[PDB]
Amino acid sequence: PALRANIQQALNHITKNIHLTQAQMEDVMRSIMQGNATEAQIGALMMGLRMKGESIDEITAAARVMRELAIKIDVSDIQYLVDIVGTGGDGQNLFNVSTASSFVIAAAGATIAKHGNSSDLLEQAGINLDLDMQQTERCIREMGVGFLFAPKAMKYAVGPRRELGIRSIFNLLGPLTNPAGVKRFVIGVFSDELCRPIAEVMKQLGAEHVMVVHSKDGLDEISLASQTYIAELKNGEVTEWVLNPEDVNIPSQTLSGLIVEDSNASLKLIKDALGRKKSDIGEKAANMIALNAGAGIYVSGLATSYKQGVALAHDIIYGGQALEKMSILSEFTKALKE
Amino acid sequence: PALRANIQQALNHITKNIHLTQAQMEDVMRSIMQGNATEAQIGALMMGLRMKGESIDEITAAARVMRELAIKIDVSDIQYLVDIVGTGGDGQNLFNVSTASSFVIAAAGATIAKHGNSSDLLEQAGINLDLDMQQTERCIREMGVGFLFAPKAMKYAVGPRRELGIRSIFNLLGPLTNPAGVKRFVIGVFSDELCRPIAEVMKQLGAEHVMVVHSKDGLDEISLASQTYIAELKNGEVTEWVLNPEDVNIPSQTLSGLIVEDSNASLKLIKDALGRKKSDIGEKAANMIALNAGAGIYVSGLATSYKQGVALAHDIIYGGQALEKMSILSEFTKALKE
């Protein structure tokens, strides 16, 4: 109709390197999400936006539309509420740092509603994820941690995305649609260049405090092995800085021993890293967790600097309380089933 | 398979602004033509190549593949054999200049195998186009003019093309696949910038003499109303020059009266323009035909300069012989049916 017209209008603008307006991008993105765009059109939009360069306004509008059509639960009343997300990096299968970090964050006193997709890992740990949306809110409120699976009816992008095989605007929108109404985030991205614009996107989306991170060694998280680039939104201001583990009194180490072959090894390593008596690899994995959980504790508002956040995370990790939070979350969700 | 792999490889190269090699483009283009590419992939390839800029090598390889899968007849033995084609310009419905030019070219002594797609026009003139490929070759050999309809099983590009609504690499390949094995061409393109690269494409495709034309007023032919940009391939050398009607003793005039509402008016105007007693608009249309048929007579080898070609065309147009060639072609094709 006129909804096919605006798609062709958009593609034409994109070929002339003219950015869609937020108005135009909502219309386009809403059309894609409602099956009002053809597959070829979706492939073209993806490729065109990728080569032009997606603008802040385009990504903002698009995420705005995505969250508009997500199931949502409201836990924005909760103090120290935070999410940790990532686009995925160059992977490379590190153990599940963000899953471990979740337990550390919750054990420290903040609350995380981790929006996601590893699930086998958690079930492997005796944690039952067969949870309705209300049982999940119970986890968040009563345990300080809940796992929002899963997350879509993003069904229309799925085929085009695997068929093109390129990173596109869609790799960005996934992490930006928190169903829990969270306002404070650590967001991993796949390049240094994405850090500032995603920070700016979260500003326009009304976020309060955000660290957008990409490490030199290709991770969408803070690396233990190398420097990490940061764009930080705080108090309406966005700044960019660089972080080395040594800045927070943690010695950089290689990622050797942190790459895992499966869920069972990941879980094994997590338990070691969060436990009171850690192996030599456990200590390394613990330090990497401290860097990332520390960023969560900080943007949550529970700690007042990144450094303090890391110190608090480190206390929890070496004190064992995060491991106990795993055990407790397991019992709770087993009870939630009967 | 590995044929989906090379598509994703290609798209990735295109996003990094790396041109496909001819080898890679054949593979890709062959896949699209054999249904081995998805719609989203085709949309993406179109958009990606459009924004990167298609290279000589990419267009060459792609046309090469297109002609590989066309029906072909061999009339390359014929002396002064020529084709006139166009991508289409900014249209804007001028009367069918190239159709009139066909009759002038043939009446002058050259031969044209006009590859195409107006058909109503010709049938309106009593010309029967319900012709098998051998009856068509008979037209070319015995009359000096034949109409190659129609032209494809380019079925796989058709939907993506109307859905995207952008000019793409496909708008270029249509005119470049002469089924008759013609080596001398006048090719209209939609921008000045396309003239030289298409001339270079025809060189790599083994053409002998080519004029690639785009007029300042947006036509993929030589305008009577404005200047026309030319890239010319001749003797293995490509040159670029600019043409005004006055250079060949024809006064530039506005296109007023040359825009037509339908086939019947187009045919009416053609007959006037090719007839012995021309109206004031007939004379203008005749002059525009002289410019374009002259380019055909020239690249055919029948005339040794563009100027001489135009003079010969002009003699035929004002002498009436091209109109008589229409009448004769009509009788011939009516006989070819019984």
CATH code (residue A241): 3.40.1030.10
CATH number of the domain enclosing B32: 1.20.970.10
Distance CA A191, CA B304 (A): 60
Closest CA to A150 of A134, A167, A169, A130: A130
Q: What tokens were used for B111? A: 């031969």
| Residues of A in Cβ contact (< 8 Å) with B47 | 11, 14-15, 43-45, 47-48, 51
How close B169 gets to chain A, by Cα (Å)?
A: 13
Answer yes or no: do A160 and A50 share one domain. no
Verify whether the Cβ–Cβ distance A47 to B163 is below 8 Å: no
* Total Cβ atoms within 10 A of residue A5: 10
After which residues does chain B have a break in its backbone, defined as C to next N over 2.5 Å? 117, 151
Q: At what angle do helices B306-319 and B97-108 cross, to 10 degrees?
A: 90
Q: What tokens were used for A245? A: 């583990």
Residue A3 sits at the chain B interface (C-beta within 8 Å): no
Burial class (CB in 10 A: 0-12, 13-18, 19+), A195: buried
Distance CA B57, CA A325 (A): 62
Q: Tell which of B22, B57, B74 closes a domain.
A: B74
DSSP letter at B17 equals: T
E-strand ranges in chain B read 81-86, 111-115, 145-148, 184-188, 209-215, 228-234, 237-243
Distances (CA, A) of A227 to A25, A187, A253, B245: 35, 16, 11, 67
CA atoms B245, B250, B254, B256: torsion sign:
negative
Contact at 8 Å (CB) between B305 and B235?
A: no
Residue A197 sits at the chain B interface (C-beta within 8 Å): no
SS3 B147: strand
Distance CA A282, CA B125 (A): 88
Task: Tell me if B309 is assigned to a ligand binding site.
Answer: no
Q: Tell which of A17, A46, A74 closes a domain.
A: A74
Verify whether the Cβ–Cβ distance B14 to A47 is below 8 Å: yes
How many structural domains does chain B have? 2
DSSP letter at B70 equals: S
Domain that holds residue B307: 75-338
Q: What tokens were used for A137? A: 């809110």
Answer yes or no: do A69 and A122 share one domain. no
Answer yes or no: do B92 and B25 share one domain. no
Contact at 8 Å (CB) between B263 and B92?
A: no
Distance CA A94, CA A100 (A): 12
| Residues of B in Cβ contact (< 8 Å) with A160 | 40
Answer yes or no: do B167 and B295 share one domain. yes
Give all strands of the β-sheet with B228-234 in edge-to-edge order. B145-148, B111-115, B81-86, B184-188, B209-215, B228-234, B237-243
- Chain A residue nearest residue B160, CA to CA: A40
E-strand ranges in A69-123 read 81-86, 111-115
Distance CA A36, CA A214 (A): 35
CA atoms B302, B303, B304, B305: torsion sign:
negative
* Total Cβ atoms within 10 A of residue A28: 28
Residue A165 sits at the chain B interface (C-beta within 8 Å): yes
| Residues of B in Cβ contact (< 8 Å) with A51 | 14-15, 47-48, 51-52
Contact at 8 Å (CB) between B294 and B318?
A: no
First to last CA, chain A: 52
Answer yes or no: do B162 and B40 share one domain. no
Answer yes or no: do B149 and B44 share one domain. no
Distance CA A224, CA B174 (A): 56
| Residues of A in Cβ contact (< 8 Å) with B40 | 39-40, 42-43, 46, 159-160, 163-164
Contact at 8 Å (CB) between B20 and B13?
A: yes
Answer yes or no: do A176 and A83 share one domain. yes
CA atoms B18, B19, B24, B27: torsion sign:
positive
Q: Tell which of B74, B94, B112 closes a domain.
A: B74
Phi/psi at A266 (5° precision): -55, -50
Distance CA B16, CA B325 (A): 54
| Residues of B in Cβ contact (< 8 Å) with A46 | 40, 44
| Residues of B in Cβ contact (< 8 Å) with A166 | 8, 11-12, 15, 44
Answer yes or no: do A208 and A287 share one domain. yes
The gap from C-alpha B304 to its chain's centroid, in whole angstroms, comes to: 21
- The structure was resolved experimentally with X-ray
Q: What is the CA radius of gyration of chain B?
A: 20
Which among B50, B51, B164 is the nearest to A40, CB-wise?
B164
B288-291 long-range Cβ contacts below 8 angstroms, 24+ apart: B288/B97, B288/B222, B288/B223, B288/B224, B288/B258, B289/B97, B289/B100, B289/B101, B289/B104, B289/B313, B289/B317, B290/B104, B290/B250, B290/B314, B290/B317, B291/B222, B291/B223, B291/B224, B291/B245, B291/B248, B291/B250
Verify whether the Cβ–Cβ distance A39 to B44 is below 8 Å: no
How many angstroms separate the most distant Cα atoms in chain B? 65
B200-208 long-range Cβ contacts below 8 angstroms, 24+ apart: B200/B56, B200/B233, B200/B238, B201/B56, B201/B59, B201/B60, B201/B63, B201/B176, B202/B176, B202/B233, B203/B233, B203/B236, B203/B238, B204/B56, B204/B57, B204/B60, B205/B60, B205/B63, B205/B64, B205/B176, B207/B183, B207/B233, B208/B183, B208/B184
Which among A11, A38, A166 is the nearest to B11, CB-wise?
A166
Phi/psi at B239 (5° precision): -135, 165
Answer yes or no: do A83 and A61 share one domain. no
DSSP letter at B209 equals: E
Contact at 8 Å (CB) between B46 and B164?
A: yes
Which among A45, A51, A164 is the nearest to B51, CB-wise?
A51
Answer yes or no: do B150 and B14 share one domain. no
Distances (CA, A) of B9 to A90, A219, B149: 17, 23, 36
Answer yes or no: do B33 and B126 share one domain. no
Contact at 8 Å (CB) between A58 and A91?
A: no
Give every CB contact of residue A149 below 8 A, 6+ residues apart in sequence.
Answer: A116, A117, A119, A129
Distance CA A125, CA A119 (A): 10
DSSP-assigned letters across all residues of B148-173:
E------HHHHHHHHHH-S--THHHH
Give every CB contact of residue B247 below 8 A, 6+ residues apart in sequence.
Answer: B307
Verify whether the Cβ–Cβ distance B12 to A166 is below 8 Å: yes
Answer yes or no: do A55 and A109 share one domain. no
